[PDB]
Amino acid sequence: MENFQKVEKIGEGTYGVVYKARNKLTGEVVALKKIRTEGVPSTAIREISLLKELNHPNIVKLLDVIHTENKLYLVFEFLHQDLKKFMDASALTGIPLPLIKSYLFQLLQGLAFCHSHRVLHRDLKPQNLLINTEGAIKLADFGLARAFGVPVRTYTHEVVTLWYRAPEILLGCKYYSTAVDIWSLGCIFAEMVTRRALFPGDSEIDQLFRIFRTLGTPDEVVWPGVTSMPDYKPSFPKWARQDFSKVVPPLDEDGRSLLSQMLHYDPNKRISAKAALAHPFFQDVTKPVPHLRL
Numbered sequence: 042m043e044n045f046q047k048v049e050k051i052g053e054g055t056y057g058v059v060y061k062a063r064n065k066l067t068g069e070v071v072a073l074k075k076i077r078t079e080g081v082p083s084t085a086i087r088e089i090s091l092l093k094e095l096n097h098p099n100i101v102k103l104l105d106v107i108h109t110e111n112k113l114y115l116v117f118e119f120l121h122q123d124l125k126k127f128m129d130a131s132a133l134t135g136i137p138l139p140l141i142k143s144y145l146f147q148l149l150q151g152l153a154f155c156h157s158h159r160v161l162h163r164d165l166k167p168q169n170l171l172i173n174t175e176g177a178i179k180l181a182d183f184g185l186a187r188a189f190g191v192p193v194r195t196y197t198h199e200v201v202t203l204w205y206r207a208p209e210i211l212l213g214c215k216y217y218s219t220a221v222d223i224w225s226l227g228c229i230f231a232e233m234v235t236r237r238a239l240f241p242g243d244s245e246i247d248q249l250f251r252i253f254r255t256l257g258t259p260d261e262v263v264w265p266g267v268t269s270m271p272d273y274k275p276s277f278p279k280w281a282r283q284d285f286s287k288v289v290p291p292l293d294e295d296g297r298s299l300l301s302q303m304l305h306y307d308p309n310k311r312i313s314a315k316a317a318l319a320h321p322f323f324q325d326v327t328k329p330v331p332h333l334r335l
């Protein structure tokens with residue numbers, strides 16, 4: 042914008058670019074997302090306004106929304122690092138389990154909160170989970186297709202990551218449920234533990250089949266109605282479910298039990314964020330502080 046001094050480009054959001062910026066008058070440092078001509082939906086901005094009144098310690102605060110000049114700017118409180126960079130920086134030693142547990146616990150609180158407010162994230166991934174020196178982690182870049190849409194590109198030729206997409210989405214479900222966020226978080230949880238993406242698909246079908254090769258090709262037994270889904274094909278190969286202890290070694294049984302519930306094929310059997318918070322895995326949860334190199 043004009044009242045902002047771009048310090049540097051932080052990346053590519055889901056609808057545009059993200060800059061670290063400084064409010065030329067207040068001096069506050071923020072994250073500024075620039076969106077996109079048609080004219081911007083009203084149904085969108087209102088689903089956005091909802092996002093403004095969404096205040097929780099594990100949700101990145103959306104400070105302002107400016108529509109002017111055939112471009113949409115979203116001003117967010119700024120955090121210094123995303124989980125993707127942190128995981129990469131921790132690849133050699135791995136993130137300590139107490140920190141992994143604390144982050145998962147906080148993200149479930151964040152989700153429990155948005156979900157109870159009928160708000161879905163829709164596109165959780167390490168790049169949109171932000172952390173601070175304080176040991177907090179927050180949900181960022183909500184993709185609400187109800188606040189806009191779920192396109193095939195961010196805005197200008199970018200390879201969308203499908204690694205965290207719930208199977209029901211890949212199978213053509215038109216109406217996502219809060220369960221899609223639990224699935225994505227489950228994938229992230231596994232990745233923090235093993236230091237390797239759980240399902241690194243390179244295409245929608247490869248994504249689907251990597252899920253199938255690991256969790257078993259779903260059928261009507263484990264997922265009633267799956268064979269009636271839009272993109273389900275009787276021709277899908279039939280892979281057996283892999284031993285789960287091979288999936289996330291060396292995560293303890295409480296952790297594996299919880300991940301297992303976050304990765305249930307049936308959206309209705311998949312654990313809710315509220316229930317996951319009560320899982321025995323969190324009995325000894327604490328809030329360690331990360332070693333952040335900024």
Ligand SMILES: Nc1nc(Nc2ccc(S(N)(=O)=O)cc2)sc1C(=O)c1cccc(F)c1
Nearest residue numbers: 054072117118119120121122123126181182
């Ligand atoms: N609030 C906020 N802060 C950020 N800082 C930051 C600082 C450093 C790093 S990094 N690669 O670790 O050096 C990453 C993010 S991004 C962001 C967003 O709200 C956001 C995130 C994703 C997409 C989007 F559209 C907006």
